[PDB]
Amino acid sequence: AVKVGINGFGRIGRNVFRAALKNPDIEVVAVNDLTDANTLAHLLKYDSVHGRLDAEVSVNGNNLVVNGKEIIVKAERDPENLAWGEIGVDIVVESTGRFTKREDAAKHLEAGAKKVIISAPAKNEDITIVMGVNQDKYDPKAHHVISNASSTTNCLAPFAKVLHEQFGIVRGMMTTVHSYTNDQRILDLPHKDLRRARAAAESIIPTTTGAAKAVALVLPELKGKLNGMAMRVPTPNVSVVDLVAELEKEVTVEEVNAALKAAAEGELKGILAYSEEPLVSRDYNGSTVSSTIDALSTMVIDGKMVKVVSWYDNETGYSHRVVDLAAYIASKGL
Amino acid sequence: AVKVGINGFGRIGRNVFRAALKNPDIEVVAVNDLTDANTLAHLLKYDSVHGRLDAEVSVNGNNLVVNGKEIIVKAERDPENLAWGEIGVDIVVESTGRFTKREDAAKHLEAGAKKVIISAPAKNEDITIVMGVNQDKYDPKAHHVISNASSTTNCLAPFAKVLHEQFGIVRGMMTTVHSYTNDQRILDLPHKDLRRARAAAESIIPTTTGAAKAVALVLPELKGKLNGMAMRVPTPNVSVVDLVAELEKEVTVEEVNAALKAAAEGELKGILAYSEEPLVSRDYNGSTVSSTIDALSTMVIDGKMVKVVSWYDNETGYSHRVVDLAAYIASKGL
Amino acid sequence: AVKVGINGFGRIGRNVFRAALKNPDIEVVAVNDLTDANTLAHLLKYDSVHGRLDAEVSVNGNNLVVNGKEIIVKAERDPENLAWGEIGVDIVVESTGRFTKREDAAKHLEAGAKKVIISAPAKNEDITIVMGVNQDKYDPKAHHVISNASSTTNCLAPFAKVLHEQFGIVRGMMTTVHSYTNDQRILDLPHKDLRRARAAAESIIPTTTGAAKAVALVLPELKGKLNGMAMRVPTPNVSVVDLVAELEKEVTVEEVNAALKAAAEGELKGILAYSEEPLVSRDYNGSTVSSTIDALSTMVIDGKMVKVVSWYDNETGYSHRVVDLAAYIASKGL
Amino acid sequence: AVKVGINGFGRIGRNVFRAALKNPDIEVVAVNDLTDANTLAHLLKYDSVHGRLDAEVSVNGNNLVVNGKEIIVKAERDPENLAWGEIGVDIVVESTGRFTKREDAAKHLEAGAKKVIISAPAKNEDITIVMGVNQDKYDPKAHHVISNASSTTNCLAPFAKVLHEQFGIVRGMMTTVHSYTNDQRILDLPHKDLRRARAAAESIIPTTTGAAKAVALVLPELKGKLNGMAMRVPTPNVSVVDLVAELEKEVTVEEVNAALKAAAEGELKGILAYSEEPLVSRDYNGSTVSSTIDALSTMVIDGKMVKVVSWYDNETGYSHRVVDLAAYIASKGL
Numbered sequence A, B, C, D: 001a002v003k004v005g006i007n008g009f010g011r012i013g014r015n016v017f018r019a020a021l022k023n024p025d026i027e028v029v030a031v032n033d034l035t036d037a038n039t040l041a042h043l044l045k046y047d048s049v050h051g052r053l054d055a056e057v058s059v060n061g062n063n064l065v066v067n068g069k070e071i072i073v074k075a076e077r078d079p080e081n082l083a084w085g086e087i088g089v090d091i092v093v094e095s096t097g098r099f100t101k102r103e104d105a106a107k108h109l110e111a112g113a114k115k116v117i118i119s120a121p122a123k124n125e126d127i128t129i130v131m132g133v134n135q136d137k138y139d140p141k142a143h144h145v146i147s148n149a150s151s152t153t154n155c156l157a158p159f160a161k162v163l164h165e166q167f168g169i170v171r172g173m174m175t176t177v178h179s180y181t182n183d184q185r186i187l188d189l190p191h192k193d194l195r196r197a198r199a200a201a202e203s204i205i206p207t208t209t210g211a212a213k214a215v216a217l218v219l220p221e222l223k224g225k226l227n228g229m230a231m232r233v234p235t236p237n238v239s240v241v242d243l244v245a246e247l248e249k250e251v252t253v254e255e256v257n258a259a260l261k262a263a264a265e266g267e268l269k270g271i272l273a274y275s276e277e278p279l280v281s282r283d284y285n286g287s288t289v290s291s292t293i294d295a296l297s298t299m300v301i302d303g304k305m306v307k308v309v310s311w312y313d314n315e316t317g318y319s320h321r322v323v324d325l326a327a328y329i330a331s332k333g334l
């Protein structure tokens, strides 16, 4: 139905493309990057993390062809030259990681697009949305540049919503043991973050994250109640959130998990998941939900301090949420 | 001075041997394992984690020779046949990981040894000691089988002591992002812990740990105040403790770090360290201290919740503490 | 059809089971290992290398239930106590790694089995077979303890066959950059092979291999003409054979690749495959063929020396060849 | 003595600096990259591969201060704006990776430099040199832009020299199982080489290499006789050359190894080394030689075909050869 365009056909760009294939309401008709159709086609066909694409892929002229459907391939470094309007693209997924500021993301709008979804925390966005938590705050009339937050926030926000509405959160701190990403470095190179400058596959790398505070963006009641950090480790994909929080009401482990399980089977079905299996990160590769509670890890002290651990395929979960948001926005009128 | 014997010449056994080379008060005269002198000599000479041994190594007869010093090599599976007494071994470092129960560890005593140091949490030990925290509780007259706890507890205990004596700990939870060890599995094999059964270098593996509760063994005041877990990740060595705790007194980040830094330069010098550099796990390989505070990671909410992150070379730090304990015990009289 | 038993439900054991699900001529009614049905069921369902098994898996008291069918679980360290005869098991896949010698493998026969397939190079086996190369040499009346060779031999033999019949091999040498396996070590531990004693996920590890020599067991004409080595590297699965050989007939790269391709689309279809894609090891995880030619790597000098590179999923290709062999052996009468 | 400048303070840049500290004939007075003195100082002090630099490192306003000496830090993306002449820099090590073509490298000369050492295979260089093989061909009056070849060529050339002079090489093919480098990608990203575009730490990655052909630049007699490929694997450093060659003279493994050993203890000492130890890649990290023969791997068939395996720390060996070359070039007059 709605024509979509992806700017930055990378880990998120391609994952989003695959998710879109499952939703007949959104049609990805064009992608943009900094290489040729040949290369983008080869990357989409063979993925080191998610395997071989289950569809026919070819190159026709200077474009891609997926299961007979033709996808326009652009290679414009400057978003202003994307002419999205010219080909009827209404929604643009900004996943280059270079245009998180509104002044840059808005270039897609000048190019003819109607809505822009920044696939990451943003700067001066009209609004930040986490599906299953605050999509209702989206306002078609004023929100044109939207942020889908980070995968980490998308994992924490949902169960943080549950703990707070069910038991009340006084304060809490989190740590996300996160798989390395392309923002890091192969072997000790310059980086604004002296931590991320170090060989990604050789160390446990502590780094700062705003995912905790960003939760306040979608859950205002929690402003100033959370903070945390990240630890990048030697895994190519799949991460996990570890939250330690002080609760108002007195509770037991069973209660906490019971609340989380009910929410996952209820109002958060498809967003929050609940597992009582003793699994590891590899088992969650391909997971489409935003957050799966590792129930066996639930822990409580004095009935006031709790530890909740949740899994998330940082590439997949988030990309599926991007498509949900794109469909949600389209259904609101363009 | 005191003759030492090492049972289980592995990651800890060999690391302990190297540490002993630096202390003229302890002399390691015999090691036992399940292989031949040739093999143990080759392992001691070339280490994948700590590099080539800086000393001359050879094999003479059925024994090892390190810088001209001869080390007896035994290959007795059953500790009772070690005849430590016959060669004058008074202290035995039990690092096979198979004899953590007192009934097994005591076999070294029947063999003629006077004291046994179990290099891990134990079962029914006469006492568990963490150097810099409770070595004063050691009683030469009644403590013959001693536990040096785990490397994780050795990392947490010291700064937990400081936070509690300085600000008072109501309760706290910790998570140790830990390098894989030989207790794990290369590729999905049977293991009592269905988590540790999974390919160690391919996933982030959540696992349970008693390091938090074990802190109570050396710091009785903290009984029932702590609990936590571990996450084994794809790194061959070096781990980090992440503690989230509720404090009694109201404090600031600067205060917390100031207290930790003073303790590291004071009463805990050589045990607790303090760093304000943005480093990663590889930078701590070879670290001899038990715990180095990553000050930049210190974080506080409402002046009541704090996050303290500390580094520890799980093999090296602990092994150096084993030698300290052996010397400490010897100085108490055998 | 013919009932099979798996002794050693490990990487090959469980992969052999997966393949058997697709082969109507064979049925797995029992497996034996050193643990409980709950551990094996958990391992069968969650695989760090091949993902979640696409089938119903549960535990029936003391047995496994896969897609309704009930699999009997044994835990006999001694093959002589398996009593295969009491459950009608005719063919036993010996994949423990401990019974590669006929004296030991033959115990399954004493236990009621009729044929034993050793999943690896063996000692004193009645015959060594490489599917697609010499299954014709199989003698139902004389061969009871059969070896399915190694996965490396299964990868090399098929195209070595093609090269020799088509151009004649004077002599050659190979190196297989092979993924690590459970025969190695996590962190420097005793091992008969001092190279394999070293941390598997940390180095490139040269180790000897008899795969090249073994080719002669299935292709007599190549006796004494081939030799090689292995290099274990930090990947969990998938390997590649690198053969450099002197040919009798003068050839060009195009002619060598054409012969390999024709053989793959002809007589060796399903056993040998041919690829002109610039792929990497991760791309062959799950591959069921025994050998896939990496055509872009084919090289020639003076029209006499050639380099042929072929990929292989050491777990899947081999495990499927084992099932193929079991079905073949059965079609000959037991 | 002669003042040197390093353009590109990366893996080779910083390793070249470490080696220069030990060479009295050369002094590094300035380095150029794309960041601030604080970033470079932090990278120089903490290395994920080679550990903490054993020296005093600090920042003096806008420059580096190593063991007292002050190093000027530049940040000019355009080599033409380096003004080496104004600071007396005579020799410049071009190790950015972006200026391997003479048209670009020659800019340093236009900037006041007298000689330029390109740390890699080059295009239109006045001459390519492999230390210990053909430095004699150097012409101070005609050669201004010199290439120090690749680390792979530096590893292969020295023993290829020995084999040819001693037995005569008819033809051969090599494969270098090489550690990943910064030229690769963290997670499937565009790259001219579709193989190198794939996650470096997740697969075995075949890639082309001109190292074998390049040998002819330093050993004319071997022109058109050698060829090969590379296989990038999941290790951060250290590589190994695997050469299979047809010899003119009939030989035994013992004679080949004896020749290699004699050459290592003779004319090629310090360049070529010989080892009879069963080591692994981690053992050669820090090795300063260009090539170390793994004698246990030497193999021969029909007394004519031989396989020689040699190790090399692609970062350290090469970087030291660069310093050696710089000192040599200087001893010839600038």
Ligand SMILES: NC(=O)c1ccc[n+]([C@@H]2O[C@H](COP(=O)([O-])OP(=O)(O)OC[C@H]3O[C@@H](n4cnc5c(N)ncnc54)[C@H](O)[C@@H]3O)[C@@H](O)[C@H]2O)c1
Residues within 6 Å of the ligand: A007, A008, A009, A010, A011, A012, A013, A032, A033, A034, A076, A077, A078, A095, A096, A097, A098, A100, A119, A120, A121, A149, A150, A151, A181, A182, A183, A314, A315, A318, D187, D189, D190
């Ligand atoms: N990787 C994760 O787990 C994850 C999860 C959620 C959100 N994100 C966010 O999504 C964004 C992209 O992340 P990624 O991991 O996919 O990165 P990536 O580096 O893998 O992909 C980025 C793609 O954008 C292209 N690109 C860069 N500049 C371009 C330009 N100017 N014009 C057009 N194309 C250009 C690159 O060629 C590349 O293919 C970031 O903002 C990041 O923080 C990442």
Ligand SMILES: NC(=O)c1ccc[n+]([C@@H]2O[C@H](COP(=O)([O-])OP(=O)(O)OC[C@H]3O[C@@H](n4cnc5c(N)ncnc54)[C@H](O)[C@@H]3O)[C@@H](O)[C@H]2O)c1
Residues within 6 Å of the ligand: B007, B008, B009, B010, B011, B012, B013, B032, B033, B034, B076, B077, B078, B095, B096, B097, B098, B100, B119, B120, B121, B149, B150, B151, B181, B182, B183, B314, B315, B318, C187, C189, C190
């Ligand atoms: N690895 C760490 O980071 C770490 C840190 C602190 C404490 N520990 C503890 O120390 C112990 C050993 O750990 P490791 O990592 O060195 O293990 P390891 O497996 O590397 O070494 C154990 C050694 O003991 C030998 N051994 C086993 N059974 C034997 C027997 N019956 N008799 C004689 N020798 C035998 C093995 O051959 C091996 O060399 C464990 O209890 C463990 O929990 C480990």
Ligand SMILES: NC(=O)c1ccc[n+]([C@@H]2O[C@H](COP(=O)([O-])OP(=O)(O)OC[C@H]3O[C@@H](n4cnc5c(N)ncnc54)[C@H](O)[C@@H]3O)[C@@H](O)[C@H]2O)c1
Residues within 6 Å of the ligand: B187, B189, B190, C007, C008, C009, C010, C011, C012, C013, C032, C033, C034, C076, C077, C078, C095, C096, C097, C098, C100, C119, C120, C121, C150, C151, C181, C182, C183, C314, C315, C318
């Ligand atoms: N992994 C590969 O790439 C590969 C490929 C081809 C052939 N092989 C061969 O197959 C065999 C097994 O290899 P793997 O990788 O599956 O090993 P593995 O260690 O993963 O599996 C072996 C299984 O056998 C069990 N076992 C051990 N002793 C036992 C006993 N006495 N009785 C019953 N069960 C016992 C273990 O518990 C384990 O689950 C070896 O001979 C090996 O060389 C391995």
Ligand SMILES: NC(=O)c1ccc[n+]([C@@H]2O[C@H](COP(=O)([O-])OP(=O)(O)OC[C@H]3O[C@@H](n4cnc5c(N)ncnc54)[C@H](O)[C@@H]3O)[C@@H](O)[C@H]2O)c1
Residues within 6 Å of the ligand: A187, A189, A190, D007, D008, D009, D010, D011, D012, D013, D032, D033, D034, D076, D077, D078, D095, D096, D097, D098, D100, D119, D120, D121, D150, D151, D181, D182, D183, D314, D315, D318
């Ligand atoms: N890494 C090895 O194993 C190895 C061995 C031998 C030769 N080499 C060669 O040496 C060169 C560099 O390799 P590396 O591994 O050190 O790479 P690297 O990426 O680690 O280092 C390159 C450095 O150059 C800097 N740089 C890039 N453009 C610049 C510019 N225009 N001006 C100034 N600085 C700039 C980067 O910031 C970086 O720090 C390559 O040509 C490579 O082929 C690498």
